[PDB]
Design a binder for this molecule. Structure first.
Ligand code: HEM
Ligand SMILES: OC[C@H]1O[C@@H](O[C@H]2[C@H](O)[C@@H](O)[C@H](OCCCCCC3CCCCC3)O[C@@H]2CO)[C@H](O)[C@@H](O)[C@@H]1O
Ligand SMILES: OC[C@H]1O[C@H](O[C@H]2[C@H](O)[C@@H](O)[C@H](OCCCCCC3CCCCC3)O[C@@H]2CO)[C@H](O)[C@@H](O)[C@@H]1O
Ligand SMILES: OC[C@H]1O[C@H](O[C@H]2[C@H](O)[C@@H](O)[C@H](OCCCCCC3CCCCC3)O[C@@H]2CO)[C@H](O)[C@@H](O)[C@@H]1O
Ligand SMILES: OC[C@H]1O[C@H](O[C@H]2[C@H](O)[C@@H](O)[C@H](OCCCCCC3CCCCC3)O[C@@H]2CO)[C@H](O)[C@@H](O)[C@@H]1O
Ligand SMILES: c1ccc(-c2ccc([C@@H](c3ccccc3)n3ccnc3)cc2)cc1
Ligand SMILES: c1ccc(-c2ccc([C@H](c3ccccc3)n3ccnc3)cc2)cc1
Ligand SMILES: c1ccc(-c2ccc([C@H](c3ccccc3)n3ccnc3)cc2)cc1
Length: 465
C-alpha cells in the first residue's frame, strides 16, 4: 500500500555526487541484496522505482504493459536542482518532434531499394576497405561507426559515401568525436542567467569547421536533387522532402522550424547508429576471446551461405548457431545496463506496493541479461543459452536487450539486420587476431558513461582464401 522499500533520501549532506558505475554497481548490488528485486531510491527528493531481474521486469513491462507504458523523465542529476524534471516550455515543439520522428521513420522503410540491399552493399564496401589494411592491427571504431552511418546517408542522399570522403569523415566527427568543455560551476550558472543553454560539446573552432563543410554539401545536394527531381520517381529522402514541400507556403520563421526539425531528427538517427556500432565492436572483442566459436560460425557460414555469394537476411533462419552467438553478444554486450526510464500511467499495484501515477521506473535490463534464474552461465559467453538439445534456436526469458512491452525499441529491426549482415559478411571474408591471447582478453567496459562501451582495442582482419 506504499512505495517499494528502500533507503531514505536523507541525510542531505550525504554526498549528492554519485558519479561512476564501478561504485554505482556496488551500491546497486547492496540495495538489491537488502531490499529485494523491487526497491525505491531517491534522486533528490524524487522517488524512483527500480526493477531487478527477469521476473519483476516482465511482470511490469509485459503483465501490466499499459500501466508501465509511460515515457521517462529527464531529471537534473547535479546537487543543485537535484531531481528536478526539465521539459520544453512549448508542448507543441515536443509533439511536432514525435510526429516528424515517426513520419521520417516510416519514410525510411519505403523506396524501391530495400534497406537489406543497402546494408549488403555497405558490407561489400567494408570488406574491400579492410583488405587494403593487409591485416595490420587497427582500431575498428571509425569503420564500425562508418558502416552504420552510411546506411542513413545512402537513404538520405541516394548513395553511400566512400570511407575517406572528407564530408563523410567530418560528419562522423560531428556526431561521434569527443570534445572537451571547460567551465566552472559559476560560469555555467552565469550562462543560464544570461538566457543561454549550451548542452552539446563543441566550441566555435572545434565544430564550425566540420559543420561548415557539411552544410555546404547538404545545400548543393539539395540543389542537384531539385534540378533533376522527378515527382513520379522520388530517388531518396531529399526528394521526399522536396515533394512534401510543394505548397509548404509558410513564413520564414515557420519554414525555419520545419527544416531545422528535420535536421534535428536526422541527427537523432545518426546518434542511434552508435548502439549498433558498439554492439559490433563488443561482438568482435568477444570473438577474439573465443577463436573456436568464431570458427564454428565461419563453418556455419560455409555450410549455409558458401563463399561465392554475400550473406542475406533470410540465411539467418538456417544459421541457429550464429544466431545464438549474436544473442550472446547483445546479452553480454549489455549496452544499456540500467534500462531506459519509464513512468506509470496511473497509481499502480505491483508486488504488494503502490507506485503513484507518474512515478519514474527503471527496468534494470542488465539484471535480466545476467539473470542466474534464466541463464545457466549468466557471466560467461554461452550460445547454449539459446539452443535446444538438437542445436536449434530457442528463446530465453532473460533476453531483452531492446527492452519489452509497449515502449520496446523502435529500431530493433534494423539493428538486428545490420548485426547479422555485418557480422556474417565480415567473418565470411576474414579471420581475426590480436596480440592479446584469448585467455587474456578483457571484456570490461570503459569506466565512463552511463552505458557499456568496450574500451579501444587492437584487432586485425586476415583476408581469407
Ligand atoms: C543494438 C542496438 C539497439 C539496442 C540494444 C537498443 C535498445 C533500446 C532500448 C533498451 C530502448 C528503451 C526501451 C524502453 O523504453 O523500455 C530503446 C528505445 C528506442 N530505440 Fe533503440 N536500441 C538499439 C537500436 C536502435 C536504433 C538503430 C534506433 C534508431 C533507428 C533506435 C531507436 C529507438 C527509439 C526511437 C526508442 C524509443 C521507443 C519508445 O519509447 O517507444 N534504437 N532502444
Ligand atoms: O537567399 C536564400 C538562399 O537560400 C539558400 O539555401 C536554400 C537551399 O538551396 C534550399 O535547398 C533550402 O531548402 C532545403 C534545405 C533545408 C533542409 C532540407 C533537408 C531535407 C532532408 C535532408 C537534410 C536537409 O532552402 C534554402 C533557402 O531557404 C540558397 O542556396 C541560395 O541560393 C539562396 O539565395
Ligand atoms: O540515504 C542514506 C545512505 O546514503 C548513502 O548510501 C547511498 C549511496 O551513497 C548512493 O551511491 C546510493 O545510490 C543509489 C542510487 C543509484 C543506484 C540505483 C539505481 C539508480 C538509477 C539507475 C538504476 C540504478 O544510494 C545509497 C542510499 O541512499 C550512505 O553510504 C549510507 O550509509 C546511508 O545510509
Ligand atoms: O504535449 C505536451 C506534453 O508535455 C509533457 O511532455 C514532456 C515530456 O515528458 C518531456 O520529456 C519533454 O522534455 C523536452 C525534451 C527534453 C529536454 C531536452 C533539453 C534538455 C537540456 C539540454 C537541451 C535539450 O517535454 C514535454 C513537454 O514539453 C507531458 O508529459 C505530455 O503528456 C504532453 O503531451
Ligand atoms: O502512432 C503513435 C506511436 O507512438 C509510439 O511511437 C513513439 C515512440 O514511443 C516515441 O519514443 C517517439 O519519440 C520520438 C522522440 C524520440 C526521443 C527524442 C529525445 C531523445 C533524448 C534527447 C531529447 C530528445 O515517437 C514515436 C512516434 O510518436 C508507439 O511506440 C508507436 O507504436 C505508435 O505508432
Ligand atoms: C536515483 C538516485 C541516483 C540516480 C543516479 C542517476 C545518475 C547517476 C550517474 C550515472 C553514472 C554511471 C552510470 C549511470 C548513471 N550519472 C550522472 C550523470 N549522468 C549519469 C547516478 C545515480 C538515479 C536515481
Ligand atoms: C545527413 C543528414 C543530416 C545531417 C545533419 C548534419 C548536421 C546537422 C546539425 C548538427 C549540428 C551539430 C551537431 C549535430 C547536428 N543540425 C542539427 C539540427 N540542425 C542542424 C543535422 C543533420 C548530416 C547528414
Ligand atoms: C528519430 C530517430 C531516432 C531517435 C532516437 C531515439 C533514441 C536514441 C537512443 C540513443 C541516443 C544516443 C546514442 C545512441 C542511441 N537510443 C538508445 C537505444 N535506442 C535508441 C537514438 C535515436 C529519435 C527520433
Amino acid at each position: 500500500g506504499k512505495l517499494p522499500p528502500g533507503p531514505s533520501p536523507l541525510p542531505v549532506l550525504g554526498n549528492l555526487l554519485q558519479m561512476d558505475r564501478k561504485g554505482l554497481l556496488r551500491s546497486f548490488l547492496r540495495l538489491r541484496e537488502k531490499y529485494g528485486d523491487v526497491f525505491t531510491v531517491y534522486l533528490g527528493s524524487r522517488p524512483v522505482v527500480v526493477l531487478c531481474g527477469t521476473d519483476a521486469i516482465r511482470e511490469a513491462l509485459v503483465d501490466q504493459a499499459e500501466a508501465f507504458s509511460g515515457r521517462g523523465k529527464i531529471a537534473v542529476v547535479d546537487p543543485i536542482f537535484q531531481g528536478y524534471g526539465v521539459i520544453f516550455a512549448n508542448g507543441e515543439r515536443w509533439r511536432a518532434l514525435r510526429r516528424f520522428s515517426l513520419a521520417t521513420m516510416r519514410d525510411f522503410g519505403m523506396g524501391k531499394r530495400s534497406v537489406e540491399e543497402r546494408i549488403q552493399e555497405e558490407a561489400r564496401c567494408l570488406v574491400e576497405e579492410l583488405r587494403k589494411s593487409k591485416g595490420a592491427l587497427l582500431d575498428n571504431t571509425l569503420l564500425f561507426h562508418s558502416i552504420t552511418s552510411n546506411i542513413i546517408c545512402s537513404i538520405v542522399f541516394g548513395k553511400r559515401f566512400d570511407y575517406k570522403d572528407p564530408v563523410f569523415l567530418r560528419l562522423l566527427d560531428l556526431f561521434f568525436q569527443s570534445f572537451s568543455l571547460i567551465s566552472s560551476f559559476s560560469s555555467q550558472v552565469f550562462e543560464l542567467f544570461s538566457g543561454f543553454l549550451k548542452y552539446f560539446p563543441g566550441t566555435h573552432r572545434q565544430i564550425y569547421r566540420n559543420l561548415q563543410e557539411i552544410n555546404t554539401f547538404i545545400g548543393q545536394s539539395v540543389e542537384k536533387h531539385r534540378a533533376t527531381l522527378d515527382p513520379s520517381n522520388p530517388r531518396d529522402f531529399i526528394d521526399v522532402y522536396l515533394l512534401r514541400m510543394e505548397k509548404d507556403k509558410s513564413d520564414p520563421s515557420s519554414e525555419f522550424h520545419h527544416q531545422n526539425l528535420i535536421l534535428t531528427v536526422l541527427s537523432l538517427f545518426f546518434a542511434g547508429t552508435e548502439t549498433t556500432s558498439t554492439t559490433l565492436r563488443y561482438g568482435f572483442l568477444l570473438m577474439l576471446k573465443y577463436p573456436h566459436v568464431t570458427e564454428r560460425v565461419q563453418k556455419e557460414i560455409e555450410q549455409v551461405i558458401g563463399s561465392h555469394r554475400p550473406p542475406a537476411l533470410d540465411d539467418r533462419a538456417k544459421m541457429p548457431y550464429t544466431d545464438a552467438v549474436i544473442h550472446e553478444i547483445q546479452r553480454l554486450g549489455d549496452l544499456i545496463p540500467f534500462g531506459v526510464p519509464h513512468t506509470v500511467t496511473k497509481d499502480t499495484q505491483f508486488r504488494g506496493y503502490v507506485i503513484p501515477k507518474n512515478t519514474e521506473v527503471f527496468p534494470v535490463l542488465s539484471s535480466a541479461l545476467h539473470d542466474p534464474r534464466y541463464f545457466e552461465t549468466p557471466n560467461t559467453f554461452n550460445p547454449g543459452h539459446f539452443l535446444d538439445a538438437n542445436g536449434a534456436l530457442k528463446r530465453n526469458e532473460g533476453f531483452m536487450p531492446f527492452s519489452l512491452g509497449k515502449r520496446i525499441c523502435l529500431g530493433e529491426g534494423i539493428a538486428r539486420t545490420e548485426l547479422f549482415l555485418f557480422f556474417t559478411t565480415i567473418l565470411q571474408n576474414f579471420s581475426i587476431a590480436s596480440p592479446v591471447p584469448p585467455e587474456d582478453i578483457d571484456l570490461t567496459p570503459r569506466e565512463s558513461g552511463v552505458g557499456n562501451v568496450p574500451p579501444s582495442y587492437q584487432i586485425r582482419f586476415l583476408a581469407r582464401h
